[PDB]
Design an enzyme around this catalytic site. Structure first.
Site, PDB file in Angstrom:
ATOM      1  N   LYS A  82      81.981 -26.202 113.378  1.00  0.00           N
ATOM      2  CA  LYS A  82      83.244 -25.318 113.954  1.00  0.00           C
ATOM      3  C   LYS A  82      83.860 -24.805 112.654  1.00  0.00           C
ATOM      4  O   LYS A  82      83.820 -25.213 111.642  1.00  0.00           O
ATOM      5  CB  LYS A  82      84.045 -26.274 114.962  1.00  0.00           C
ATOM      6  CG  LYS A  82      84.656 -27.650 114.091  1.00  0.00           C
ATOM      7  CD  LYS A  82      85.285 -28.636 115.095  1.00  0.00           C
ATOM      8  CE  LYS A  82      85.432 -29.962 114.240  1.00  0.00           C
ATOM      9  NZ  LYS A  82      86.392 -30.925 114.739  1.00  0.00           N
ATOM     10  N   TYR A 125     108.058  -8.557  96.628  1.00  0.00           N
ATOM     11  CA  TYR A 125     109.144  -8.090  97.799  1.00  0.00           C
ATOM     12  C   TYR A 125     110.164  -9.017  97.782  1.00  0.00           C
ATOM     13  O   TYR A 125     110.232 -10.320  97.290  1.00  0.00           O
ATOM     14  CB  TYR A 125     108.534  -8.484  99.217  1.00  0.00           C
ATOM     15  CG  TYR A 125     107.405  -7.539  99.642  1.00  0.00           C
ATOM     16  CD1 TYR A 125     107.952  -5.988  99.686  1.00  0.00           C
ATOM     17  CD2 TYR A 125     106.153  -7.751  99.927  1.00  0.00           C
ATOM     18  CE1 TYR A 125     107.057  -4.967 100.208  1.00  0.00           C
ATOM     19  CE2 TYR A 125     105.360  -6.807 100.596  1.00  0.00           C
ATOM     20  CZ  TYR A 125     105.752  -5.530 100.573  1.00  0.00           C
ATOM     21  OH  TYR A 125     104.985  -4.287 100.887  1.00  0.00           O
TER      22      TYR A 125
END
Ligand SMILES: [Cl-]
Ligand SMILES: [Cl-]
Lengths: 386, 386
Positions: free
Chosen positions: A38, A267
């Protein structure tokens, strides 16, 4: 198979083969292994992990939901595949026609499946008993009883096995695990009372398989230990053999420059250089799964730990180096350089999470390169395939 | 296009078309828009966002790295595409043969491109000036001069535009932004001094475009505002028109049960019920990008906010509901139910991150459903293409 940014995962298929071989040697010879793939095989890639695990002597596969299983079938894989997660009833015929078994544990699911069945295809299922995980599965005796009663209307549904899952097998203390084990025993007793032969029973994940006696039953379900990582830090000291980590994550210095004292990086100028600094940029960011909460974490360049500085951006982040290096210089985020090694566990601890989540969220944007016997045997670039 | 788990992203193409239409009407009519699709179009999917943005009057597209540009080209998109991130020189001929412009700003990149040229291809490029973002781009006067001198040996490289990027356009107070603008002005002066016409200049991201006079140049580069979200909370009060969020994320109740007082839910029993509680389970988890740090976050069920309880697992999480609901009941993680709305921003704030990272990291596992004029027009299930 091409890729055009120098950022990649490296998956060592030898390592996965060795973990699976070691587990198979450690458990009783009559006990099967599901290789649990998975989550894009915990970020290692569905198909190659499945195939190598089978080659190494796993006999069965497990995945979260039906689409994952169809990825395997479309790749030519024929081994049994069980969907572990809950599936909607509308999956009945497609699971059937693709020889995929589903987890089924609700009388309502059976009601609806009877309505949706196309009449041309029998489907295999496993019953999940919830013995204390609280997630899915049957918990009560009356509940099991009505589930079985409703199964009588569905002769196209065929029991293939019965399972539970442990919530705490990675904690040193065993009180809760022992309670689960006792609860599951009671549940199997109910099932025999209602005249159902379980056929094929499995309970153990990596931690339980590697620790406990009498836990194997007919099969174990191995995820994280196959990828060569410990289920937790606290049980690491108690594992019976060395796990070999299969995944590394690398990037190359895409730019480098000297930045004057006091200038800002990234940023909101959350980092300013304190002297004239060598700042490198690499082409990976939070769109690849390398999240902003890794700012300040130290990656490896030329065998040295060096910090990520300033905000991580969608596609790039910056690093403060002690020295100039050439463009193209290898940068390692998970894996080895020289004597130094950054584990997925160390990245997870800095991030306030666990290794499972670090590996599995490496985004489909990032190519995987697969190594077997030390040579590159395959590259998968999921972007190429859109 | 099929998918076999009831978890999906909804992308409202109207909202995207509307955000772009409004931006285009807000800026001067001779200013172009790059639609910024890097990061799987911020989680919304490369191709349909590109397409609708162009239908809406964007004229150009921007991506992080070459492979993302080739996804668009293979979808038959023919609009100009710029790679904004740094690219290796080995990209030279492929970017040419595919009509993709790269960001190029390094002498050494040029020297290497010289070595690697197909002798036949011509490649378009934009110069990135770093005016204070500190990420990539030319910073110095001597650096620029040396870069332009090396280009002399590369007639196959062709200037298409010149740009810079702002680090602080999403902060109210504008000091750092004003310094960037002044640095960029000086940088363009050096470029004129050294005999180069910019041709086509762009600087503004969503926040700069929505705030500032004198910042448009020949084009703006729009990401977050196209997806209908504010670049920050601080500037939201000051945006000139209402943004329409394009993405929502939903799932269904896959199991529901009453759990007795004191029983545990999920790994390591981090939650025990305080009374007999209705606990629902949904089929989405951290492998879908819904991370463990969202434990305790409240999602929407039947218009009510309810908590995620116990550890989120790779593929599922659990929720404490006040009342029984039917299996299949809608659960909204991002989006609207009734009067209630969960924005990507709210998820980000709980997560200690920003909305960009929340949307962009929704995994390739999750199907996207596209709505135009209220009707489904397309489903993309990336797991199918494997
Ligand atoms: Cl379970
Ligand atoms: Cl930049």
């Amino acid at each position: 198979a091409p890729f055009y940014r120098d950022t990649w995962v490296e998956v060592d298929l030898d390592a996965i083969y060795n973990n699976v071989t070691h587990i198979k040697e450690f458990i009783p010879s009559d006990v099967e292994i599901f290789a649990v793939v998975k989550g894009n095989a915990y970020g290692h890639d569905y198909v190659p992990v499945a195939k190598i695990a089978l080659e190494a002597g796993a006999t069965r596969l497990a995945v979260a939901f039906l689409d994952e299983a169809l990825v395997l079938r479309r790749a030519g894989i024929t081994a049994p595949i069980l969907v572990l997660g809950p599936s909607p009833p509308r999956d009945i015929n497609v699971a059937a026609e693709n020889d995929v078994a589903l987890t089924v544990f609700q009388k309502e699911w059976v009601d609806e499946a009877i309505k949706l069945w196309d009449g041309s295809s029998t489907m295999k299922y496993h019953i999940n008993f919830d013995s204390g995980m609280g997630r899915i599965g049957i918990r009560e005796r009356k509940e099991l009883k009505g589930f079985l009663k409703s199964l009588e209307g569905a002769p196209f549904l065929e029991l293939e096995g019965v399972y539970t899952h442990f919530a705490t097998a990675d904690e040193v203390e065993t009180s809760y695990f022992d309670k689960q084990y006792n609860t599951f025993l009671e549940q199997l007793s109910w099932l025999k009372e209602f005249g159902v032969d379980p056929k094929f029973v499995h309970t153990a994940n990596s931690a339980a398989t590697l620790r406990f006696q009498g836990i194997t039953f007919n099969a174990v379900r191995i995820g994280i230990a196959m990828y060569g990582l410990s289920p937790s830090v606290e049980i690491r000291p108690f594992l019976p053999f060395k796990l070999e980590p299969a995944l590394s994550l690398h990037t190359k210095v895409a730019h480098i420059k000297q930045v004057i004292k006091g200038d800002g990086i990234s940023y909101n100028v959350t980092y300013r250089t304190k002297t004239e600094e060598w700042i490198a940029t690499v082409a990976i960011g939070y769109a690849d799964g390398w999240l902003r909460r890794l700012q300040g974490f130290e990656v490896l360049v030329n065998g040295k730990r060096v910090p990520i500085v300033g905000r991580v951006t969608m596609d790039q982040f910056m690093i403060h180096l002690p020295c100039e290096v050439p463009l193209g210089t290898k940068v390692t985020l998970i894996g080895r350089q020289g004597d130094e090694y950054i584990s997925a566990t160390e990245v997870a601890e800095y991030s306030g999470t666990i290794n499972y989540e670090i590996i599995t969220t490496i985004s489909f944007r990032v190519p995987r390169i697969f190594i077997r016997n030390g040579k590159v045997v395959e590259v998968i670039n999921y972007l190429n395939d859109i």
